[PDB]
Amino acid sequence: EEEAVRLYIQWLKQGGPSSGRPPPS
Protein backbone atom coordinates (compact mmCIF):
# COMPACT_ATOMS: atom_id res chain seq x y z
CA GLU A 1 0.00 0.00 0.00
CA GLU A 2 2.26 2.75 1.31
CA GLU A 3 5.35 2.99 -0.74
CA ALA A 4 6.13 6.40 -1.92
CA VAL A 5 3.78 7.92 0.51
CA ARG A 6 4.83 5.73 3.32
CA LEU A 7 6.48 8.71 4.55
CA TYR A 8 3.35 10.71 4.31
CA ILE A 9 1.06 8.10 5.55
CA GLN A 10 3.35 7.93 8.49
CA TRP A 11 2.05 11.41 9.25
CA LEU A 12 -1.44 10.49 8.57
CA LYS A 13 -0.92 7.57 10.84
CA GLN A 14 0.97 9.69 13.34
CA GLY A 15 -2.47 10.78 14.42
CA GLY A 16 -3.46 12.39 11.21
CA PRO A 17 -3.71 15.98 10.05
CA SER A 18 -5.99 15.96 13.03
CA SER A 19 -2.89 15.87 15.24
CA GLY A 20 -1.90 19.24 13.88
CA ARG A 21 0.86 17.78 11.77
CA PRO A 22 1.73 19.39 8.43
CA PRO A 23 0.89 17.14 5.44
CA PRO A 24 4.10 16.03 3.66
CA SER A 25 1.69 15.58 0.88
mmCIF file of N, CA and C in Angstrom:
data_model
loop_
_atom_site.group_PDB
_atom_site.id
_atom_site.type_symbol
_atom_site.label_atom_id
_atom_site.label_comp_id
_atom_site.label_asym_id
_atom_site.label_seq_id
_atom_site.Cartn_x
_atom_site.Cartn_y
_atom_site.Cartn_z
ATOM 1 N N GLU A 1 0.845 -1.217 0.000
ATOM 2 C CA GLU A 1 0.000 0.000 0.000
ATOM 3 C C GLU A 1 0.869 1.252 0.000
ATOM 4 N N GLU A 2 1.439 1.566 1.154
ATOM 5 C CA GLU A 2 2.265 2.752 1.308
ATOM 6 C C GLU A 2 3.691 2.462 0.902
ATOM 7 N N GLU A 3 4.113 3.201 -0.082
ATOM 8 C CA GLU A 3 5.349 2.994 -0.737
ATOM 9 C C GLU A 3 6.136 4.255 -0.841
ATOM 10 N N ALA A 4 5.503 5.171 -1.504
ATOM 11 C CA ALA A 4 6.125 6.397 -1.918
ATOM 12 C C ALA A 4 5.584 7.516 -1.078
ATOM 13 N N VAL A 5 4.693 7.087 -0.224
ATOM 14 C CA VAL A 5 3.779 7.923 0.509
ATOM 15 C C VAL A 5 3.699 7.323 1.889
ATOM 16 N N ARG A 6 4.735 6.579 2.169
ATOM 17 C CA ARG A 6 4.826 5.727 3.316
ATOM 18 C C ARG A 6 5.352 6.569 4.441
ATOM 19 N N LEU A 7 5.780 7.664 3.928
ATOM 20 C CA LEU A 7 6.478 8.713 4.554
ATOM 21 C C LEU A 7 5.580 9.917 4.742
ATOM 22 N N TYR A 8 4.435 9.780 4.154
ATOM 23 C CA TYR A 8 3.352 10.712 4.306
ATOM 24 C C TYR A 8 2.327 10.076 5.174
ATOM 25 N N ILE A 9 1.981 8.871 4.803
ATOM 26 C CA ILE A 9 1.061 8.101 5.547
ATOM 27 C C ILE A 9 1.517 7.934 6.960
ATOM 28 N N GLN A 10 2.803 8.053 7.168
ATOM 29 C CA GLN A 10 3.345 7.926 8.486
ATOM 30 C C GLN A 10 2.924 9.101 9.377
ATOM 31 N N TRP A 11 2.523 10.141 8.693
ATOM 32 C CA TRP A 11 2.046 11.406 9.255
ATOM 33 C C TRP A 11 0.577 11.308 9.541
ATOM 34 N N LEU A 12 -0.061 10.658 8.615
ATOM 35 C CA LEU A 12 -1.443 10.490 8.567
ATOM 36 C C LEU A 12 -1.828 9.395 9.536
ATOM 37 N N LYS A 13 -0.815 8.653 9.880
ATOM 38 C CA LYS A 13 -0.924 7.569 10.841
ATOM 39 C C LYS A 13 -0.413 8.001 12.199
ATOM 40 N N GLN A 14 0.456 8.988 12.151
ATOM 41 C CA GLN A 14 0.972 9.685 13.338
ATOM 42 C C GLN A 14 -0.144 10.163 14.261
ATOM 43 N N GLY A 15 -1.344 10.200 13.729
ATOM 44 C CA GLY A 15 -2.467 10.776 14.420
ATOM 45 C C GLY A 15 -3.314 11.530 13.440
ATOM 46 N N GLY A 16 -2.746 11.733 12.256
ATOM 47 C CA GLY A 16 -3.455 12.391 11.208
ATOM 48 C C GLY A 16 -3.227 13.873 11.215
ATOM 49 N N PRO A 17 -3.670 14.530 10.163
ATOM 50 C CA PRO A 17 -3.714 15.983 10.054
ATOM 51 C C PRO A 17 -4.395 16.574 11.276
ATOM 52 N N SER A 18 -5.331 15.790 11.758
ATOM 53 C CA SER A 18 -5.989 15.957 13.032
ATOM 54 C C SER A 18 -5.026 16.330 14.163
ATOM 55 N N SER A 19 -3.857 15.700 14.169
ATOM 56 C CA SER A 19 -2.888 15.869 15.244
ATOM 57 C C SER A 19 -2.258 17.254 15.184
ATOM 58 N N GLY A 20 -2.483 17.939 14.075
ATOM 59 C CA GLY A 20 -1.900 19.244 13.877
ATOM 60 C C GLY A 20 -0.642 19.176 13.043
ATOM 61 N N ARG A 21 -0.307 17.978 12.581
ATOM 62 C CA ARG A 21 0.859 17.781 11.766
ATOM 63 C C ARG A 21 0.651 18.317 10.359
ATOM 64 N N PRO A 22 1.699 18.912 9.794
ATOM 65 C CA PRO A 22 1.726 19.395 8.426
ATOM 66 C C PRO A 22 1.832 18.266 7.400
ATOM 67 N N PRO A 23 0.842 18.125 6.512
ATOM 68 C CA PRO A 23 0.885 17.137 5.440
ATOM 69 C C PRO A 23 2.135 17.251 4.574
ATOM 70 N N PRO A 24 2.948 16.185 4.561
ATOM 71 C CA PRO A 24 4.096 16.031 3.662
ATOM 72 C C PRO A 24 3.653 15.586 2.299
ATOM 73 N N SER A 25 2.448 15.964 2.055
ATOM 74 C CA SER A 25 1.690 15.584 0.881
ATOM 75 C C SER A 25 2.512 15.707 -0.405
#
